[PDB]
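hey can u run this one w/ flavin-adenine dinucleotide bound, need the C-alpha cells asap thx
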Amino acid sequence: AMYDIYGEAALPADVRERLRITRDLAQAFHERAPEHDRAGDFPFENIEDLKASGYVRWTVPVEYGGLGLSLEEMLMHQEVLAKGDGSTALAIGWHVGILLHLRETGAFPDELFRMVCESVVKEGALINSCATEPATGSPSRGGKPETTAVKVPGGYRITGRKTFSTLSPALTWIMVTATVADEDVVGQFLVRKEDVEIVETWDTLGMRATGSHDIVLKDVFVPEERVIVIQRPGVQAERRPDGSGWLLHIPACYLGIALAARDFALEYAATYRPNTLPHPIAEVPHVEQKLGEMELKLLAARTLLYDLARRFDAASPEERVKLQPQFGAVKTLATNAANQVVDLAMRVVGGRSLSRALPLERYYRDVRAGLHNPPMDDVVYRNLAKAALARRAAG
Amino acid sequence: AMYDIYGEAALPADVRERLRITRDLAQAFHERAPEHDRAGDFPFENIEDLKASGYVRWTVPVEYGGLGLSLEEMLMHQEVLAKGDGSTALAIGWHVGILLHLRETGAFPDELFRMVCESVVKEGALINSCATEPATGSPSRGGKPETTAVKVPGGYRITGRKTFSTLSPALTWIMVTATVADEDVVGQFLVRKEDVEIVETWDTLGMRATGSHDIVLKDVFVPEERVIVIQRPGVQAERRPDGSGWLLHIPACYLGIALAARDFALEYAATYRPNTLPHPIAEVPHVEQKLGEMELKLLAARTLLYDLARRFDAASPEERVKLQPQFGAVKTLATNAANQVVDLAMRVVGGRSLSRALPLERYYRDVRAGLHNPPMDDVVYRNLAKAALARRAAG
Ligand SMILES: Cc1cc2nc3c(=O)[nH]c(=O)nc-3n(C[C@H](O)[C@H](O)[C@H](O)COP(=O)(O)OP(=O)(O)OC[C@H]3O[C@@H](n4cnc5c(N)ncnc54)[C@H](O)[C@@H]3O)c2cc1C
Ligand SMILES: Cc1cc2nc3c(=O)[nH]c(=O)nc-3n(C[C@H](O)[C@H](O)[C@H](O)COP(=O)(O)OP(=O)(O)OC[C@H]3O[C@@H](n4cnc5c(N)ncnc54)[C@H](O)[C@@H]3O)c2cc1C
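ok here u go:
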C-alpha cells in the first residue's frame, strides 16, 4: 500500500495495472498544474483523462459495471493523484468517495442509487455534495441550512445558495441539503447541474483548480424520486452505517501533496552545493535533521491512514461506527502533518522556495486547505476524548 | 514604543507627529496592496509618498539634513508600515536601515558617506546592498562571490550577477560585493543604478512588490572614490562596530505583518456568528485560545524587539558587538513567531481565510519571507550557544 517505501512486489497484477494508470494520470496532471494554478481555471482535460481511464467508475459496485474498489486501494490512487496535482485529486476524490459512501451505506434509495450508478458507468457522470453556506459554516457543525425546500405537486422547489461547490463545472449530479420550509426539518436532494447557476467566485490561495464556486438555486424542481432523505423524528439515513470512513480521501490527498514537497526538497538538497561547502546541503546537519523529520511525519501519518482504511474494508457496519473517532484522528494528524512537512521542505530549500518557477510554493498553498475540510480538529479531539471515556465506562 | 498596547501618551510631540505620518502612509499602502500583489508589480507611488513625507532621510544624521532617528523609533515606524504593506516596508527598511548602519559604523569613507547622504536628503536617492548570488547562497555564510572586480586605471570593472535585489527599480545607489580577480579577496563597491541591467525575475509567493529582481553587471566601472572596502589581511570594515543591530528592521517588518493578521482575525471573530451559536466565534473556547496564543506570541517577541533596540541606542560599540547574539535571537523569535501568528489567524477565520478577497492569505504569503532574511536560525542558535559558553569561561 505504501509501495514507494515497501516495494510494489506485494501487490497483485490487476492492482499494479491500475497503479500504472493512476501514475500516468498523476504525471500528466503535474505537467499541467503550473498553468492551471496561474490561471486559476478548471482543468477539463484532467477530468476527460479520468473519464477515459475509467477511474470515475472504480468505486461503483461490480453489479453496475464498476470495479467495486476497496477504500484502501482508492486511498492509494488518490495519494498518487494528489502528488501530481492536489486540486484535481481532491475534486475527483469527492466523487469516487461519495460513491463508496453510498455503496457501503445504502443511503440512497435503491432505485436512485442504481440510476446514479448507471450514469457514471455509461456516461461518465460526476457527483458531489454541496451543503456549505455562509450562514451555517461547516455542515459538520449541524446548522440548519437557509436553503429552503418547499413541497409542490411533483416534489420540491429548492431555493438558496451554496459555497465551496467543488467539481461544479464538470458535475452532472449535485446533492444539496435544504431545510423544508413549513415543517422545520433538513432534507438532502439530488439536483441536476443543468438546473443551477454557477457564479464563478472561487479565487483562492491554493487548490485553485478545484472549481469550488457558488451555486445558486432559484425555484429548482426536484422530483420525488430524486429526494434522498428527509430527516424527520425517528429515521436513519444510512441503512448500514459506515462511520464516515470514506472521508479518509481527505487525508490521502493532503499527504500526497506532502510527498511531492518532500520529493522536491530531497532532490534539491541532494544536488544543491554552494561555494561554502565541500558537499551538497543534504549532508549539512540541520538540513539532514529536517529531511529526517519529514520522513518521520509521513511514516507515521501514512501508516495510520492505510491501517485504518484496511480495517474499514474488513469491518462490519457496527465496527465502522466505532472506528469513526480514529478516522478523524488520522485526518487531524495527516493534514497538520502535511502542513509541517511542506514547511520543512521550504526551509530546506530556502529563499529559492518562494519562487513561482518551482512547484514547492504551490504545495504550501494547496496543503493549507486540508485544515478546513471535515472533520474539524476540535471535534476530532473531543470525540477521541469521549470515546476514551466510554471505553473506561464499559470496563 | 508598543503604543498600541501601552498608549501614545508616553511619546513626545515630535514622535507623535512622525507617527501620524507613518500611520497615514501605512493606511494608503494598505489600500493599494491588493492590486500590487495581484499584478506582482512595483509600487512607485508608495516610494513617492515615502520621499515626499521625508521618511527616506529620517536616519541620515542631523549634520547632513536628516533627522538622525534612533533605531528604536525607526523600528516602530517600520512595524507600522509593514502592517499596511509588507513588501513596501521591507524594501524601504533596507534603505533606512543601511543608512543607520553607515551612520553608526563609519563603514563608508567620510567623503563617500557625505556624498551618499547628500543625494538622499536633496534628491531622495535610495540605496541597498545587493550581494546574494546563486553560487554562494546567503552572504552571511561567507562565500566568495563569483562577481569579479578587476583593477583598471580609474578604479574597477565589475562583472557578475546578483539575485534578490530588493528596491532595485527605484534605486539610485547599489552596494555590490565582488571578488577581486587577481588578488583573491572580497570587496564591496558602490554602483550607480544606471550602470546595471535589471532582469525582471522576481515572481514569488509573497513580498511580491519588493522588486527583488536580478541585476547584471557587464564591465561596470566603479571609480576609486566609490570603492567602499577591500577586505585584505588586517583591516576593519567598521571603524565603530554596531554588532549588526540595524538588521533588527527584519523582525520589525514581519511582526508588523503578524499584527495585521491578528487584527483581521480578531475583527472577524468578533463579528462572525454562524446559526450554530448564540454568540460570535470569539466566545468559542478553541477560538478564544488561539486568539490568546497570538497575543502571547506578539507580546513576547515585540517586547524583546524594542528592549533590544532601546539597548542598542544606549550602547557603546563594544557593548553593541556583545549584543549581536541577542539581535539574532529576536529575529529567529519574531519571524518564526510571525508565521505562527498568521497560521493561527487563518485557523480562526477558517476556510474563508483562503479567499483572495481578504488580505489574510496575502499575510500568510508575505510572512514566509522572514525565514530567509539573515541571520539564519541555525546560525542564531549556534552563536547563542557560543556566547553562553564564553560567559561561563569568563567566570
Ligand atoms: C479545498 C476545499 C474544498 C471544499 N469542498 C467542499 C465541497 O465540495 N462541498 C462542500 O459542501 N463544502 C466544501 N468545502 C467547505 C468546507 O466543507 C467547510 O464547510 C468550510 O471550509 C468552512 O468550515 P470552517 O470550519 O473552516 O469555517 P466555519 O465553519 O466558517 O468556522 C470558522 C471558525 O469558526 C469555528 N466554528 C464555527 N462554528 C463553530 C461551532 N458551532 N463550534 C465551534 N467552533 C465553530 C471554526 O472552528 C473556525 O475557527 C471545501 C473547502 C475547501 C477548503
Ligand atoms: C523578501 C526577500 C528580500 C531579500 N532581499 C535581499 C536584498 O535586498 N539583498 C540581498 O543581497 N539579498 C536579499 N535576499 C536574499 C537573502 O538575503 C538570502 O541570501 C536568500 O534568501 C538565500 O538564503 P537561504 O539561507 O534561504 O538559502 P541558501 O543560502 O541558498 O541555503 C539553502 C539551504 O541550505 C542551507 N545552507 C546553505 N549554505 C549553508 C552552509 N554553508 N551551512 C549550513 N547551511 C547552509 C540553508 O540553511 C538552507 O536550508 C532577500 C530574500 C527575501 C526572501
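The pocket of flavin-adenine dinucleotide (ligand 2) is lined by residues A 274, 276-277, 281, 284, 287, 347-348, 350-352, 354; B 90, 94, 128-132, 137-138, 141, 164, 166, 207, 210, 212, 369, 372-374, 376 (CB under 6 Å). anyway lmk if its weird
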